[PDB]
Amino acid sequence: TPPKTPRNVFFPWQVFSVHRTGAFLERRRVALKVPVNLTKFEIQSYLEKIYGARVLKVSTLIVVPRRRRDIFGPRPSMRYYRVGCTFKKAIVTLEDGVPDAVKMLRSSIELAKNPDITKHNLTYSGRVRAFKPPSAAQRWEMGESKYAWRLPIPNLLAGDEMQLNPALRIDESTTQMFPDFSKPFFHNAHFNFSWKPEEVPFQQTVKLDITPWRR
Amino acid sequence: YYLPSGHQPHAERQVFHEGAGESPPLNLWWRENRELEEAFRRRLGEAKCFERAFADSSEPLGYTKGRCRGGGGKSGRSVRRRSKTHKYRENRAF
């Protein structure tokens, strides 16, 4: 529908507006209403050339307002209509932060609608269980080695500003006391990795007896 | 006709019946030159399993076929002949 972008513009007509989201957005992210036909490259070049913004990433969604039926008022016409317009919601991740009071909505009338406060601890849809892919530090490549805190260079860089020992970050109100390794205990309490420490004694491997009648 | 590769011409075989004379070693004359190999392969590809006969008015003794000798029809069925308002465009325009 919108006119296709020419190779040379000289007079852009596209309107980039700030969109106030009812969901949560990170520190360096901002949501914009944009024409549907623009690409991520077009959006990034537009922002870097007209505003000088230092854009790192652009993510895009297409938003189509839902169908609505006029059913309520006196003498209602039961006709279908849409509120607003179809548009591209562009979430731009920049080098610098954007104020929460700008990017997100607030309310003292409906106290539950404070995404800047609730953050990602809530899903702002019908989604019940939040799905999050593993973090960059949790990945292997470019991830955080779980024994690097014992190496010389990290300790040389830490100085007195940081303490790298993970034992210092244990939450007292969540962890349990250490058990005796020679007695029945759970693996999930204090190990937090997918292998068996050698300090745990030899374990019995039990194979099911599927045909007892034969013996 | 299928010609296997020149590096593995020996196809799987059953045990030869007792008393059968030994087969001579294969003569791979078509491996001297790649051009000869390609020409031989194309020639082999030109072969056909059989050739079929068909009605052709250009042949003196050609003929076509009508309907069955008895002259009856499917029981209880009054077949409607094709027209311009019935089965008009089935499988081809005209």
Binding site: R54, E95, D96, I153, L157 | -
Partner: protein, 444 residues
């Protein structure tokens, strides 16, 4: 249709195994992008045949042919030596664009023909006022890649870039500064001028993708001024998300070099930036496979015969150690080949000197082996063992790595040929020693 029950079961099992094979196959493809970019705005619109007779070629034709061959990986020795002969014949009649494309082809293909660069550089210097950003960048880039060092001409190229700052492309300027730093061609005044210009270029003209190319530890250690260092280290924290393992590795090396050699600058950084780099030190930065060279293996063999436990080609911190002894971990060795120096000279590279100084100041006792001296030993093992023993019996090398004696291209070529012959002989008499040759057949 239907299948016989055995056939049903076998084909169903095959389908299940194919599905599981696909799932297992796609497991490690985290960094596989279906959308991919290809650069093609440097390709010329004219057509050329690369095998055409050189005597019919002019500058415009030969430059395009060289660049096309480099792009197509048509690395034929006869073709490229014909290119060299014709280009040297046509040296008088090349524009800066043609010379830039020629240098691009040579550097990209890593065709280490020193004579062509030596013969083309004077015309580059003479024609510098007419050069443009791409040509300057390409000349510096090719020289750095092939290790052809001409400090005067590199400094002149940098000065020309400074004079044309308003016309230079930001990426070209960044690459020129990096090449100047790696070749060690900028005295303090030129270094200050380049740092001053690069500061503004990065602050005003470069987004994250362009800026990340400025993060080079050699330049940070030897060229950049203190404000530029602070700005670069602060900006990397903001631009990390768009970086790759090479950028992360160079940022980490820059941070370590600043910490070890410029504690004042390290302290002038802020706590948040220092925290960023401390946390970076904890990450698994993907390296790439490294293996001992033939010379490295020969040195390891001689050392083992001498009787010193050691390990080879391992990573400590943000450095790769050639040889690290086991009994006394602080003792380490470095085997220095032809590419560790500048062509036709025994002068060490800036990266090598920086690594030597940083490791020495962090505590390593470094000893070094020079191929120019090793090659004179031949295939003898007693001589090599005595050489290594005598080196061991002497103190480690200073924190500042000094250059070796003078040499020439003639001697470099002679030594390269001798090394080729020695490699051949050693491989032959290794595999022959391995072969038993004990089964004798009474077939005759």
């Amino acid at each position: 249709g239907i299948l016989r029950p055995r056939e049903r079961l076998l084909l169903n099992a095959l389908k299940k195994e194919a599905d599981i094979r696909y799932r297992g196959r796609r497991m490690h493809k985290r960094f596989r992008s279906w959308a991919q970019q290809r650069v093609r705005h440097y390709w010329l619109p004219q057509k050329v045949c690369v095998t055409s007779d050189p005597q019919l070629m002019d500058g415009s034709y030969i430059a395009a042919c060289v660049q096309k061959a480099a792009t197509l990986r048509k690395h034929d020795l006869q073709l490229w030596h014909g290119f060299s002969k014709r280009i040297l014949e046509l040296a008088d009649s090349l524009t800066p664009q043609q010379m830039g494309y020629i240098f691009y082809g040579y550097g990209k293909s890593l065709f280490r023909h020193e004579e062509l660069y030596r013969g083309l550089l004077p015309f580059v210097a003479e024609a510098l006022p007419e050069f443009h950003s791409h040509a300057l960048m390409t000349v510096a880039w090719a020289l750095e890649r092939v290790r052809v060092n001409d400090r005067a001409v590199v400094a002149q190229i940098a000065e020309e870039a400074l004079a044309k700052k308003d016309l230079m492309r930001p990426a070209d300027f960044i690459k020129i500064v990096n090449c100047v730093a790696r070749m060690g061609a900028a005295p303090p005044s030129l270094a200050a001028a380049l740092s001053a210009e690069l500061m503004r270029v990065l602050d005003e003209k470069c987004n994250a993708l362009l800026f990340r190319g400025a993060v080079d530890h050699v330049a940070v250690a030897t060229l950049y001024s203190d404000p530029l260092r602070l700005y670069l280290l602060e900006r990397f924290t903001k631009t990390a998300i768009c970086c790759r393992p090479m950028h992360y590795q160079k940022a980490f090396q820059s941070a370590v070099a600043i910490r070890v050699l410029h504690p004042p600058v390290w302290q002038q950084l802020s706590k948040a930036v220092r925290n960023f780099y401390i946390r970076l030190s904890l990450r698994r930065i993907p390296q790439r496979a490294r293996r001992p060279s033939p010379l490295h293996w020969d040195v390891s063999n001689a050392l083992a015969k001498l009787g010193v436990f050691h390990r080879n080609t391992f990573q400590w911190g943000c450095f790769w150690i050639d040889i690290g002894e086991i009994d006394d971990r602080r003792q380490c060795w470095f085997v220095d080949g032809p590419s560790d120096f500048y062509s036709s000279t025994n002068e060490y590279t800036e990266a090598n000197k920086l690594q030597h100084r940083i490791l020495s100041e962090l505590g390593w006792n470094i000893r070094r082996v020079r191929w120019n001296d090793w090659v004179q030993l031949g295939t003898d093992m007693d001589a090599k063992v005595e050489y290594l023993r005598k080196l061991r019996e002497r103190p480690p090398w200073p924190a500042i790595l000094t250059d070796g004696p003078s040499s020439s291209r003639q001697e470099m070529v002679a030594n390269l040929r001798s090394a080729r012959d020695v490699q051949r002989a050693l491989k032959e008499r290794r595999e022959k020693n391995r072969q038993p040759h004990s089964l004798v057949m009474n077939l005759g």
